[PDB]
Design an enzyme around this catalytic site. Structure first.
Site: not given
Ligand SMILES: [N]S(=O)(=O)[C][C][C][C][C]C123[B@@]45[B@]67[B@]89[C@]1%10B81%11B698B746B814B562B%10%1143
Ligand SMILES: [Zn+2]
Ligand SMILES: [N]S(=O)(=O)[C][C][C][C][C]C123[B@]45[B@]67[B@@]89[C@@]1%10B81%11B698B746B814B562B%10%1143
Length: 258
Positions: A62, A92, A94, A104, A117, A196
């Site tokens: 992603h 990370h 986008h 975003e 982010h 997001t």
């Molecule tokens: N773009 S953002 O809104 O900054 C993503 C924030 C961090 C998500 C990390 C995760 B890692 B684990 B818990 C949250 B769910 B599972 B995997 B799935 B992935 B998602």
């Molecule tokens: Zn993000």
């Protein structure tokens, strides 16, 4: 699962497996700068990254994540709109296929070339996995990227990308200082929102910095050479890995600055 950014599995499809996609506090949003109210009660943001210990960089299919050791109290975000202490776990980006899109969040409908982010979890919940189940579990610091002068503090990230071209590749990435990715000013907007990406959990206090960082065209071009696909699969460039702005619904965006 099988969500992504393409015509067949992109943001308009996500609700079928993640129905919270149509929820009441989804992210990102357009930041209407004239409607965002200055809140004199908001505190300066406290970003304490002096002891941050980066460990690894991963292409997860992603984006790419720069991961941190979050086992000690070492890289923390506090103050601003937050109650308590939030620990850095990863950052990370986008980004777009073209310099005219990629962010975003938008600012008066303006799209930036990319968005960083920095993801933090509330230490009162003990672990990231428990934090994402809480409405105040995460704090994500968002920083816009525009194309102009190079960001020297980004170059170490850019140069490792050739080693993680495809989904599932990782590389050791120690001693990276995320302070080199910040702009000068910590003026911000804030609002309650969501991840997001699927699962789109409504667990995030968003803090979006007003001042973008500048990166060079060459730096962002190297982001665009990454692949969504795995090794030995047909090449799909990792571009346009952004969710568009979602309805604001019953939310107020607050500004830390006049
Ligand atoms: N773009 S953002 O809104 O900054 C993503 C924030 C961090 C998500 C990390 C995760 B890692 B684990 B818990 C949250 B769910 B599972 B995997 B799935 B992935 B998602
Ligand atoms: Zn993000
Ligand atoms: N709701 S969701 O998680 O965005 C999944 C939406 C449907 C996924 C079905 C697919 B998977 B990838 B893209 C689309 B093409 B290729 B493979 B093929 B199967 B069909």
């Amino acid at each position: 699962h099988h969500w992504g950014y393409g015509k067949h599995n992109g943001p308009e499809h996500w609700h079928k497996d993640f129905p919270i996609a149509k929820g009441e506090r989804q992210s990102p949003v357009d930041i209407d700068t004239h409607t965002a109210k200055y809140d004199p009660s908001l505190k300066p943001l406290s970003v304490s990254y002096d002891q941050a210990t980066s460990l690894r960089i991963l292409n997860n299919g992603h984006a790419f994540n720069v991961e941190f050791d979050d086992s000690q109290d070492k890289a923390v975000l506090k103050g601003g709109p937050l109650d308590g202490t939030y620990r850095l776990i990863q950052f990370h980006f986008h980004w777009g296929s073209l310099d005219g899109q990629g962010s975003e969040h938008t600012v008066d409908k303006k799209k930036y070339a990319a968005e960083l982010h920095l993801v933090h979890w509330n230490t009162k919940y003990g672990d990231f996995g428990k934090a994402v189940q809480q409405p105040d579990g995460l704090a994500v610091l968002g920083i816009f990227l525009k194309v102009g002068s190079a960001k020297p503090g980004l170059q170490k990230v850019v140069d490792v990308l050739d080693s993680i071209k495809t989904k599932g590749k990782s590389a050791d990435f120690t001693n990276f200082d995320p302070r080199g990715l910040l702009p000068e000013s910590l003026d911000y907007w804030t609002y309650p929102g969501s991840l997001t990406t699927p699962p789109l959990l409504e667990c995030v206090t968003w803090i979006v910095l007003k001042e973008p960082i500048s990166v060079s065209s060459e730096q962002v071009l190297k982001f665009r050479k990454l692949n969504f696909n795995g090794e030995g699969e047909p090449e799909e460039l990792m571009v346009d890995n952004w969710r568009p702005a979602q309805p604001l619904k019953n939310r107020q965006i607050k500004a830390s600055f006049k």
